[PDB]
Design an enzyme around this catalytic site. Structure first.
Site, short mmCIF file in Angstrom:
data_model
loop_
_atom_site.label_atom_id
_atom_site.label_comp_id
_atom_site.label_asym_id
_atom_site.label_seq_id
_atom_site.Cartn_x
_atom_site.Cartn_y
_atom_site.Cartn_z
N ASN A 1 28.08 63.06 46.47
CA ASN A 1 27.24 64.11 47.01
C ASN A 1 27.48 65.47 46.36
OD1 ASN A 1 25.13 64.50 49.18
ND2 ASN A 1 26.44 66.15 49.75
N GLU B 1 19.70 53.39 40.08
CA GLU B 1 20.60 52.27 40.10
C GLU B 1 20.96 51.79 41.49
OE1 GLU B 1 20.63 50.88 37.38
OE2 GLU B 1 21.26 52.12 35.76
N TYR C 1 20.58 55.81 28.71
CA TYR C 1 22.00 56.21 28.81
C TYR C 1 22.67 56.52 27.49
CZ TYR C 1 22.32 54.74 33.69
OH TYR C 1 22.24 54.66 35.06
N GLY D 1 -2.07 45.78 33.97
CA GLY D 1 -2.99 45.60 35.09
C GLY D 1 -2.68 46.45 36.29
N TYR E 1 12.63 53.76 36.48
CA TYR E 1 13.20 54.66 35.51
C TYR E 1 12.75 56.09 35.84
CZ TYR E 1 14.09 55.79 30.46
OH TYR E 1 14.49 56.31 29.23
N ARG F 1 18.13 49.83 42.47
CA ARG F 1 18.11 48.56 41.76
C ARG F 1 19.16 47.57 42.22
NH1 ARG F 1 17.99 51.93 36.43
NH2 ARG F 1 15.76 51.97 35.86
#
Ligand SMILES: Nc1nc(O)c2nc(CNc3ccc(C(=O)O)cc3)cnc2n1
Length: 268
Positions: free
Chosen positions: A142, A178, A124, A51, A81, A181
């Site tokens: 970095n 990640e 992964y 939807g 993702y 997340r």
């Protein structure tokens, strides 16, 4: 000539990146993923796949680097993702693992001359095998991200070598998807940036990365807040502990993938 819908772009450069600029980056990415709030047990939920119009399905993260090169990753808004990337006038995508996804992908970098879909998926599991190393042995920070943006950029002209590219995807995924997340992993990259340190993730980071779908499911199925089965996590030293309910996770996890229609209301 055209198609429709231009995805939100969020930019970030590794050139003199600070704690403040990375915090800002990660909060704009989350701000663009979750459309305000479907909230279960005080954790926001990501947009439901069924939807959702193609016009809201992706977000773009433009990375530039000290050598003044940019790569734009495309992230799927349902699960954060990284589905593929664009470097100059070439786009590359991981193999979609079902057909609405395959066609959702065709809306993403339509203007580029040269678009390719790799045969392999981007989990992964495959990435590590192609890279020839596990996430436990790959440095994050970095400096690693700076390097990875260059590798991704020169894949297109043969600078290449698939191990190096797979390896650069692992770095990008962990420091962007990640970190968005999980508040803990954003903390882990922030420590690396404030001290100009590069180091591989330890087991506590990796086991949350493998557990995200299962944590998302256990929380949305929980009776009041207790899990019908404990998720097994890991401490920095490698030892395991069980998590019995949502409460200790609220400062650890930032976003969950949608699993169930909310059994109570609570979110208003
Ligand atoms: N390319 C890519 N980009 C990610 O952001 C990612 N995240 C994880 C962490 N775990 C997963 C696994 C599967 C999924 C799902 O199907 O929705 C989401 C997260 C593992 N591989 C990944 N690979």
């Amino acid at each position: 000539m055209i198609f429709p819908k231009q995805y939100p772009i969020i930019n970030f450069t590794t050139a003199g990146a600070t704690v403040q600029s990375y915090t800002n980056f990660i909060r704009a990415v989350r701000g663009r993923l979750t459309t305000g709030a479907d909230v279960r047990h005080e954790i926001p939920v990501l947009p439901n796949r069924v939807g959702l119009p193609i016009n809201q399905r992706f977000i773009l993260v433009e990375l530039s680097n000290h050598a003044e090169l940019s790569v734009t990753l495309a992230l799927d808004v349902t699960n954060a993702y990284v589905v593929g990337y664009r470097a100059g006038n070439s786009a590359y995508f991981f193999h979609p693992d079902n057909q609405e996804d395959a066609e959702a992908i065709t809306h993403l970098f339509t203007d580029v001359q040269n678009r390719y879909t790799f045969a392999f998926g981007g989990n992964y599991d495959r990435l590590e095998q192609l890279a020839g190393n596990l996430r436990e042995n790959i440095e994050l920070g970095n400096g690693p991200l700076e390097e990875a943006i260059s590798a991704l950029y020169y894949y297109s002209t043969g600078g290449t070598q698939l191990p190096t590219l797979a390896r650069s995807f692992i770095i990008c995924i962990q420091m962007i998807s990640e970190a968005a997340r999980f508040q803990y992993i954003e903390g882990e990259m922030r420590t690396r940036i404030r001290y100009n340190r590069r180091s591989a993730p330890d087991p506590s980071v990796i086991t949350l990365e493998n557990s995200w779908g299962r944590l998302s499911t256990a929380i949305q199925e929980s009776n009041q807040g207790a899990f019908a089965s404990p998720i097994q996590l890991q401490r920095r030293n490698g030892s395991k502990f069980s998590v019995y309910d949502v409460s200790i996770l609220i400062p650890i996890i930032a976003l969950m993938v949608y699993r169930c229609a909310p059994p109570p209301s609570s979110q208003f």
